[PDB]
Design a protein around this nucleic acid. Structure first.
Ligand SMILES: *OP(=O)(O)OP(=O)(O)OC[C@H]1O[C@@H](N2CN(C)c3c2[nH]c(N(C)C)nc3=O)[C@H](O)[C@@H]1O
Lengths: 70, 139, 94, 126
RNA sequence: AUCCUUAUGCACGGGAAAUACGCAUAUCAGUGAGGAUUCGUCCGAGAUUGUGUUUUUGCUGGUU
């Protein structure tokens, strides 16, 4: 189900196998926080870091090497 | 092409030959518009980096500096002329003129061998060398 | 390339300094004759040129902030591996 | 130090931490150890664990706070040690580690260090 | 006091390999690297990127 998500298929095809793993962990981190969180008050904020990292990290994989002096 | 620098006076030619003690000084004599003087300007530019450690390259135009036309006798679109310690070097490509170079060489690799051969033979004071591949038939 | 920068000669001939070794009526008439013949007797740029005018618009800050050296095939890595694979040889056993 | 995290509990002192981290590493070399959260969470579900060590100053702490509630159901002791960087070293890792679970082998060489430390840890859970 | 276990250090003796061993004012990385799957789940530490040397490194001896 995760494979069909947004944070994966918005990226080139080469970086898919690196982005499941990178996202699947942060899902479980997110899900562990949700259990922890009190029912009356639920606060997001953890997600913001975990998207920021993910989008920024996915860019870097795609970017590719700087060119080399011959 | 913009990789490789150009020499705008005959006085830039002569100092450039002198000041480079340890490396070949390779010069293409010919004029920008030419069909064949553009092609060589490519095959050199690609090679110039690989070779920076034993050879230095420059570009000169017969029209910009015509001072050198009679002494080295320059005819045709372009001539490649190799210098080491002010001594004009010389190689037989099987073509029937041992001075300079005329024809357009085909591969990057076969061009690097010739430079390397000239340098190695040259280092020993030898005035003639032999191009391993002899393109008399070609040109 | 320090000399390349400087720009000034002595009022000096090129051949001599290094130590160099080398390894009007008729004319007028000819010119006239030639003329009597001239009287008698690109695409790529067009394709593009039209784009080049299009460029004019772009700002000088943008001209600067242009990404510089992007490789998309990882050519360098593959080439190195190939050289390493092809380096030496070995002798075949008896 | 910094303000030790109020949710951190039991928090081992200085003298127990030396005794615990030493056991950790002593198990690392027999590969009876398991490092990290998920690796530790796996252990409890299977039922092989001896005790869990956690990092107290794990930032944010909520990411490991599920372990305590799982440990209490499987009846497995646990404690926090004051830094993650120290726990990273003991597991044989360059880099910070927030949790670790020693496991069971009852033929083991170190068996008697472990029962020693669990005995000490279960005291802290009052 | 003997004995036994693991880790690390110096070391005699015995082997195998150098297409192998490193290095970086550099990117991430148990807050999960990279894989396996009988599809239920299972292993858990390096992967990128640039680079140096690599039919050899130092050192002696014979014979001309
Ligand atoms: O070898 P040495 O006699 O020098 O030992 P020390 O003089 O350093 O002194 C006291 C320590 O002796 C050891 N011994 C000695 N014996 C006979 C002995 C020891 N230990 C034990 N156990 C503790 C099981 N049993 C013994 O019969 C101890 O290390 C003493 O500290």
């Amino acid at each position: 189900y995760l494979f069909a998500s947004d944070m994966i298929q918005k990226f080139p095809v080469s970086v898919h196998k690196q982005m499941l793993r990178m996202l699947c962990a942060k899902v479980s981190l997110a899900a562990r926080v949700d259990a922890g969180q009190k029912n009356g008050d639920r606060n997001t904020v953890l997600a913001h870091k975990w998207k920021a990292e993910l989008s920024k990290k996915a860019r870097k994989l795609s970017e590719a090497p700087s060119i080399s002096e011959t | 092409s913009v990789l490789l620098p150009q020499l705008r006076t005959g006085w830039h030619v002569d100092q450039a030959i002198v000041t480079e003690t340890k490396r070949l000084v390779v010069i293409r004599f010919g004029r920008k518009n030419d069909r064949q003087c553009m092609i060589m300007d490519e095959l050199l530019s690609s090679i110039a980096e690989r070779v920076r450690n034993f050879a230095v390259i420059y570009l000169c135009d017969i029209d910009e500096v015509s001072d050198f036309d009679e002494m080295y006798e320059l005819t045709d679109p372009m001539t490649v002329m190799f210098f080491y310690h002010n001594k004009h070097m010389m190689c037989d490509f099987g073509t029937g003129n041992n001075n300079k170079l005329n024809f357009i060489v085909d591969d990057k690799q076969e061009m690097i061998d010739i430079l390397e051969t000239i340098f190695r033979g040259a280092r020993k004071n030898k005035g003639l060398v032999v191009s391993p591949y002899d393109y008399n038939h070609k040109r | 390339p320090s000399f390349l920068d400087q720009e000034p000669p002595a009022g000096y001939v090129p051949g001599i300094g290094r130590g160099a070794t080398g390894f009007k009526t008729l004319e007028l008439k000819l010119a006239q004759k030639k003329k009597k013949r001239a009287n008698e007797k690109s695409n790529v740029k067009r394709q593009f040129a039209d784009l080049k005018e299009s460029l004019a618009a772009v700002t000088e800050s943008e001209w600067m902030d242009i990404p510089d050296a992007t490789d998309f095939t990882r050519r360098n890595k593959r080439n190195r591996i190939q050289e390493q694979l092809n380096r030496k040889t070995y002798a075949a056993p008896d | 130090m910094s303000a030790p995290n109020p949710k951190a509990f039991p928090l081992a002192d200085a003298a127990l931490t030396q005794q615990i981290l030493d056991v950790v590493q002593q198990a690392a070399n027999l590969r009876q150890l398991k490092k990290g959260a998920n690796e530790a969470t796996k252990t409890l579900n299977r039922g092989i664990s001896e005790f869990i060590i956690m990092a107290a100053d794990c930032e944010p702490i909520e990411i490991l706070l599920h372990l305590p509630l799982l440990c209490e159901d499987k009846n497995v002791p646990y404690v926090f040690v004051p830094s993650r960087v120290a726990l990273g070293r003991a597991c044989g890792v360059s880099r910070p580690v927030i949790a670790a679970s020693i496991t069971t082998n009852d033929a083991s060489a170190i068996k008697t260090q472990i029962y020693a430390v669990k005995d000490k840890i279960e005291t802290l859970l009052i």
